[PDB]
């Protein structure tokens, strides 16, 4: 229980940010064909900065608690091995695929948004377990964080 609750504390901060821009907790309509529906309120940049500032602490607290824990490790590790070939022929993708070993990802290969202007590395596993898949998700959180660093630092002015 404790991991879920500690993280759902921080989920509240992020939803508040969605609320700040769009006006809805979830289910914004903020992204629209001609770009985003609306501009951003001033200062939301800074609040994002402190939130990102603290998120490393929060994520590490749960990470140190739960990644190494024997019960969790044995409870997930070597569960449902997903071999590489079997993964492809079944039409997988995402961190599942990326965990099984395939070095594929849509951001790096078929970039669609400003990801051209951000440098970062995806995580990859080599065991195809639920555990190393879980690790891949955890490292993805960390890597996304630096992506916010790049973008939020370089944000240009202009129309929206």
């Amino acid at each position: 229980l404790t991991p879920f609750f500690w993280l759902f504390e921080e989920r509240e901060k992020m939803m508040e940010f969605y609320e700040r821009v769009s006006g809805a907790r979830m289910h914004a309509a903020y992204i629209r064909p001609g770009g985003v529906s609306l501009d951003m309120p001033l200062g939301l940049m800074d609040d994002i900065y402190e939130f990102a500032s603290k998120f490393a602490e929060r994520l590490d607290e749960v990470e140190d608690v739960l990644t190494t824990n024997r019960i969790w490790v044995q409870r997930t590790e070597d569960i449902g091995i997903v071999t590489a070939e079997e993964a492809l022929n079944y039409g997988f993708s995402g961190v599942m695929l990326r965990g099984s070993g395939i070095k594929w990802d849509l951001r790096k290969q078929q970039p669609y948004d400003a990801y051209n202007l951000v440098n970062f590395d995806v995580p990859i596993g080599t065991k195809g377990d639920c555990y190393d898949r879980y690790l891949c998700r955890v490292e993805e959180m960390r890597q996304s964080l630096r992506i916010i660093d790049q973008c939020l630092n370089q944000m240009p002015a202009g129309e929206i």
């Binding site: 200062g43 070095k103 290969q109």
Partner: protein, 89 residues
């Protein structure tokens, strides 16, 4: 005198127990932005340029074509590969 914190003793033990130097998580008015802000002006766009700005010579929806038939394209006129080989390995 700035943020409601547990008394200094419990703070020190708390830092000890965690094993990392602790930084506060609750959000205070001081910590977060000036919560009432001046009115923003959104800078005018580049197509709002006032002249030489014809829609006909910058529009996309009227620019797209129907799909072309490649065989018939040739009839009008290095083993080929869909794209740069990726070492998905």
């Amino acid at each position: 005198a700035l943020r409601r914190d547990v008394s200094p003793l419990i703070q020190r033990i708390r830092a000890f127990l965690l094993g990392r130097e602790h930084n506060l998580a609750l959000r205070f008015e001081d910590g977060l932005a000036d919560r009432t802000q001046p009115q923003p002006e959104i800078p005018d766009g580049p197509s709002h340029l006032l002249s030489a700005n014809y829609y006909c010579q910058r529009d996309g929806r009227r620019e797209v074509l129907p799909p072309i038939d490649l065989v018939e394209q040739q009839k009008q006129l290095k083993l080929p590969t869909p794209g740069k080989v990726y070492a998905w390995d």
